[PDB]
Amino acid sequence: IYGWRKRCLYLLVLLLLIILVVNLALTIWILKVMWFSPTGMGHLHV
Amino acid sequence: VYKVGIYGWRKRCLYFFVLLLMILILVNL
Amino acid sequence: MTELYQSLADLNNVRFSAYRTAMKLRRLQKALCLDLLTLSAACDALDQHNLKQNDQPMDILQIINCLTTVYDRLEQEHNNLVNVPLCVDMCLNWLLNVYDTGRTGRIRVLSFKTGIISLCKAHLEDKYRYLFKQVASSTGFCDQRRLGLLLHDSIQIPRQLGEVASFGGSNIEPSVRSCFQFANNKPEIEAALFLDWMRLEPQSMVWLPVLHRVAAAETAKHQAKCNICKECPIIGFRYRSLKHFNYDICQSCFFSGRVAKGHKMHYPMVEYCTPTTSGEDVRDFAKVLKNKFR
Description:
The structure is cut from a larger assembly and holds chains A (46 residues), B (29 residues) and C (294 residues).
Chain A: H1 2-32
Chain B: H1 9-28
Chain C: H1 2-9, H2 17-32, H3 39-48, E1 57-58, H4 60-77, H5 84-99, E2 107-108, H6 109-119, H7 124-135, H8 144-155, H9 158-161, H10 173-182, H11 191-199, H12 207-217, E3 221-222, E4 234-235, E5 238-241, E6 248-250, H13 251-254, E7 269-272, H14 278-293
Antiparallel strand pairs in C: 1-2, 3-4, 5-6, 5-7
């Protein structure tokens, strides 16, 4: 039934949405505690 | 006397997009 | 009615019996515009002419007067859909087709009542209760003879079209025997027992519930694809196999007898006549997975 077909389709869309949301949260974290710059981590340069 | 219409190629391209975003975001995680 | 029957004669494609009778009777009722008539208007019209005795002889004039009483109200409700003289002629034609095989000009009130109540727009159990009250006595009891008369009046209908033998013929005796065997050999039957025996779907009366179902499903729209002619969405009758998976067939290919993947040792089928409920279809899908697991 295309009905439950579409239902599970945007259920999968919802799952991809939550994984993207948590990934952006983790990457904003990974940018914050790192003081990240193209020169390198922190105020030094690797 | 045959008349049926449902968008099918749009469904395949939507499944393709869902597949590629799944691949990409699982790789990112 | 000659051109109506000529149009009917090209519709001999129905494989089964009850489906054929229901579809043809629905086509007639919509064509006769008697589906616009309700139980209340017909009851008021028949009680207005004092046609209460079931054994009262009926001449042409009394039937004409009652038909005029019905069709005046029908036209007042359906000015753009009902023409009184043509409809009166057509309904007289049909009623005297069913119950005037002798060309004597005399019929019974009970037969006319049964025909109109069956062919009107009302609840199935309401028509059942009214017909039982018509055939039962003042105490509400019905013996073998009144039931036999009612069954005889009912069986006068399929013989007019030519599908009387498929439902046990014109012999009402087996039907009365089955009804009174369900009655635990009681001398008389009651309205509740009559309703229960009718819901048991006897051979000689299933045509009327099949008519009610096809009338209901004429406006049904199912979000599904026909597993032969690939028709999506399903409009009308949806048929779902109870053995295989993802097999849904529309009545357009079902009535022709064409079968996909062949039939089985047993090929169970469920017949949705209404848009489905997701809980119920998930439950029956779980049931069919359980069946195929074994």
